[PDB]
Design a protein around this nucleic acid. Sequence first.
RNA 1: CUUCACACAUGCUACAAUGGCCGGUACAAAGGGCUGCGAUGCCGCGAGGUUAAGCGAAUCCUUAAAAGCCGGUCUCAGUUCGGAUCGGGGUCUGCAACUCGACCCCGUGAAGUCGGAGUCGCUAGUAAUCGCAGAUCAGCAACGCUGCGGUGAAUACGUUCC
RNA 2: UGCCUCCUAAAAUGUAACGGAGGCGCCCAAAGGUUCCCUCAACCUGGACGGCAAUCAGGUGGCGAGUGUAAAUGCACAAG
Lengths: 119, 124, 116, 178, 57
Amino acid sequence: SVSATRRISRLRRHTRLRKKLSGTAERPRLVVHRSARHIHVQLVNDLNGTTVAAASSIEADVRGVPGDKKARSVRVGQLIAERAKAAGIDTVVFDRGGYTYGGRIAALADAARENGLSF
Amino acid sequence: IPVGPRLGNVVVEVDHLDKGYDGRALIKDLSFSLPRNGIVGVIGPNGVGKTTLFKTIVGLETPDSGSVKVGETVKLSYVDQARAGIDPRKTVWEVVSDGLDYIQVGQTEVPSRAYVSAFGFKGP
Amino acid sequence: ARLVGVDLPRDKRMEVALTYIFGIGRTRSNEILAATGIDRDLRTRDLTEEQLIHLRDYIEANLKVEGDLRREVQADIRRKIEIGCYQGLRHRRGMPVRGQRTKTNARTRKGPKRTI
Amino acid sequence: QPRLKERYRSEIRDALRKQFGYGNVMQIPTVTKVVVNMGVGEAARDAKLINGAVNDLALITGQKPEVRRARKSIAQFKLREGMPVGVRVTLRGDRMWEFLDRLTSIALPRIRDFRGLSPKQFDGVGNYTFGLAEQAVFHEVDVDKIDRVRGMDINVVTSAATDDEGRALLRALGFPFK
Amino acid sequence: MKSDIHPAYEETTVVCGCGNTFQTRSTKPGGRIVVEVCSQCHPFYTGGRVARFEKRY
RNA sequence: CUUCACACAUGCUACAAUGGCCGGUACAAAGGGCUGCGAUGCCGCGAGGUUAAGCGAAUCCUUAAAAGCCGGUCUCAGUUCGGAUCGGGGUCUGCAACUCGACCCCGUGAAGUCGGAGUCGCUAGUAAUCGCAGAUCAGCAACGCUGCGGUGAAUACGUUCC
RNA sequence: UGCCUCCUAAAAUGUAACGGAGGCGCCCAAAGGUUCCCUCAACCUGGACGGCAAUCAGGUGGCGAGUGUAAAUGCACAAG
Ligand SMILES: Nc1ncnc2c1ncn2[C@@H]1O[C@H](COP(=O)(O)OP(=O)(O)O)[C@@H](O)[C@H]1O
Ligand SMILES: [Mg+2]
Ligand SMILES: [Mg+2]
Ligand SMILES: [Mg+2]
Ligand SMILES: [Mg+2]
Ligand SMILES: [Mg+2]
Ligand SMILES: [Mg+2]
Ligand SMILES: [Mg+2]
Ligand SMILES: [Mg+2]
Ligand SMILES: [Mg+2]
Ligand SMILES: [Mg+2]
Ligand SMILES: [Mg+2]
Ligand SMILES: [Mg+2]
Ligand SMILES: [Mg+2]
Ligand SMILES: [Zn+2]
C-alpha cells in the first residue's frame, strides 16, 4: 500500500522533530496539517494539551480567495497570525508536521511572520 | 612483465605512412613491419615525431595518407611519456586498483597489494 | 549480418561465410547460392537486405540449422544410452564407438596421457 | 502517448472484469514498475563496468542506471563491502509502457533459438521475472562497439494479488508464454 | 537530476520486413531503427524407430 | 585372437602461401584378366545399378597417371590450413557386417602453429616428393611388403674426433 | 606491578587473595559539528552466467543485525 505508508512515514517524521520542539504557554506551537485540498493550523500549548487559536482553509473566508493553493495558504497564514494576537501571543515555534519546509507551508510561515508572529 | 597470449605472424604493418600537423610534415612515406620476438629501438632527436608514431599505432591519432594495420592476435600495451594516467591527489595503491582487492594482469588474478608490492611499493 | 541467429563475419566470401552456420558446410552452401541466384564470389558486406530475405527462407524450408539440429544430434546420442545398445555403453565411458582400436590410440574420445 | 498504454485502458482494462469478478474498478491490476539489472559479478576484478555495463543500459532503457554496492564481504567471491557489483535501472510511468512495447514487439523474438517464456516464473503475488542472454537483442546497443557480452534479468511488478491474476494481465500485454 | 545526464530519447519510427510498422520513443539516432523480424513475422507467434523401418521397407 | 589407467617400436597424414580450392590442358613404365576384365548407352550428386560390344589377350578391357603447365580466387587466420571424433542416410561383397569390413554422400570440425635429452637414412638418376600395378583375396581394416616409372637436388676440405 | 570493563561483592557506595575471564600505551581531517532523510539481521518465494551465500523483485520480520577498538551499561525515538 502507499496510503498506509504515507501516514506511518509522516507521523514518524513528525515524532522525530517533536523530541526537541515542544512549545509552552508563553511560546505556543504552530502545528500545520497539509492535505491535498486544504491546510489546517492550530497553536497547541504542550503542557495541558489546549489549543488556544486555530485557522483552516475549509472555512468560508479562505475558500473564496482566487488563485492557486499557495495563495490560500497565505490567507490562512494571515488568519492565525491575527488570532494569536487576540489571545496575547507574539512569539511561537513552528512545527513542520513531518512535511518539508517549502511550498505551501513556507508560504504559510512567511505570511505569518509579516503579520506579527516573530519566529 | 606479465606474459601475454600467442603472437601471430603479422604484428604491426605500416605501408606508406604520412603524418603531420601543419605545413611541417613529420613522417613521410614510411614502410616497415614489426617483427615477432624482438626488441625494436626508435632513435631520433627531440620534436621529430616519435610519440606521434606510437599514437597512430595505438589508435589515438589519424594518419594523413597510408594506413596502420595491426592484426587479429595483438593485444597492445602502452606506457606513455607524459604519465597522463596517474593523477596526483590519489594514492599509489588505488590508482593501480580502484578500491578493488584483486585485479586482472592478463587472464590471471593476482591480488592488488601483492601486485604493487612486486613493484617495490611495500608496506605503508 | 544476422541470417538465422549466427551473425556472419564481415569481409568474407559468401561461398565460405555461410559455412559458419551450424548445419551448412561447403556443398550445401553451394546450393543456397544456387536456388537464390546470389553469386559465390560476393563479399558479405555488400549483402543486400532484399537479398537476405531470399536466403532466410530457403533454409527454413529445406535445411536444418542451429537449435533444432543440435537438439537432434544430442537426442540420437540420448536414444542409444538408455536402450542399452553397444554404442550406448560405449558413449557412457568415453571410448570410440565405430570399432576403433583402443590399444594404442583413441586419444580423441579420451583426453591426453594420464601416465600411470 | 504510447500505444501500449492506450491499448491497456481500451480493452485489457475491461476484459479483466470478465475473467475475474471484481466489484470495484480500483481492484483491476496494473503493472507499476519494470526493474532491469545486469548484476556484473566480474567487476570485483578489473574495475571496468562504467564503460561497459552503464553505457549499454543507458541505451537500452532510456535513463542512466544506479551502481549498486555489495552489502557484506564474501571471501569465496573475491568481494568486499561497498564494492560495485550491480547496475540497476528502474522504469516508471510512460517510459515503462514504451519499454514493454519495445521489448515484446521487436526485441524479444531476436533471442537465438527462441521458443517462449515460462509461465511458472511468478513469485507468489503476481510479479514476473525472466532473464536474457547478452548485449544482443536490443538494437540500441550495437554488436561492434562493445566489450565482453553480458546479460540481464527483468522484473515486472504488478498490483495483482495472486499468480494467475498476473498471468492474465501479461498475456494480454503480449508476453509469449507456453 | 532529470536534466543533461540522461541520453537522447526522442520519437522513433520502426519498420519491419513484413510490412508492419509502428511509432515509439527510443534512443536510436535519426529515428530509423529497422528490424528484420517482429512480433508478427516470427514463429511461435503464428505457428519413432518403428515408422522408419516401414519407410525403408 | 580387435579388450585398455598405460609404455615402447615401424609408418601414414598434418601443422600451410615452394600452399589450399575451382576451371582448363600435356607426358609414363611395369603388370592383371573366363566361378573373369565390363567398352559403349541409359539411370544415380556419388559409391555404384542395368544393358552388353570386344577379348585366354603386342588385338579387347584394365586406362583418367599424379606431381607439372596456364588462368581465377583465398591474404596469414587454429584459417577456404588440418580431417580426428561423432549424428543421420546409402551402396557393395557374403549364409551373415552387433561384437568386427571397405567405399560413398551430407552434417560435425579434435589435437597440431615444425617438436626436450637424444636419435635415423642417404654420395647420383641417389636422397626428397608424386602416382600406378602385382601377390594373398568373396570382400577388406594395404598407410605394410615386392615392384614400376615421373620430376630431380646439396656437399665430400679431410682422417683430428665417435 | 599503572590504566580500562565484568564476576567474586552478600539487590546504595566501597571491599582482599600468587581468585575467575578479557582489553590498553591507540585510531578517525571524518568515524568531528549541524540540518534533513531512511530501517536492520535471519528466513521463505521467483530470476542469464550464479552455487548455502554477490546484485534484483515481492512477502515475512520490533530487534536476534549494527556500534573503529575488550567488557558492561545504553541505543530501533535511534547513539545503527
Ligand atoms: N596536438 C598537436 N598539434 C600540433 N603539433 C603538435 C601536436 N602534438 C605534437 N606536435 C608537434 O609535433 C612535433 C614532434 O613531436 P614528437 O617528436 O612526436 O614528440 P616526442 O619527442 O615526444 O616524440 C613537436 O615539435 C610538436 O610541436
Ligand atoms: Mg617522445
Ligand atoms: Mg593379431
Ligand atoms: Mg581442406
Ligand atoms: Mg551422369
Ligand atoms: Mg598456379
Ligand atoms: Mg590449441
Ligand atoms: Mg600459421
Ligand atoms: Mg657407398
Ligand atoms: Mg584384394
Ligand atoms: Mg554493590
Ligand atoms: Mg550490600
Ligand atoms: Mg557528518
Ligand atoms: Mg548517525
Ligand atoms: Zn514483420
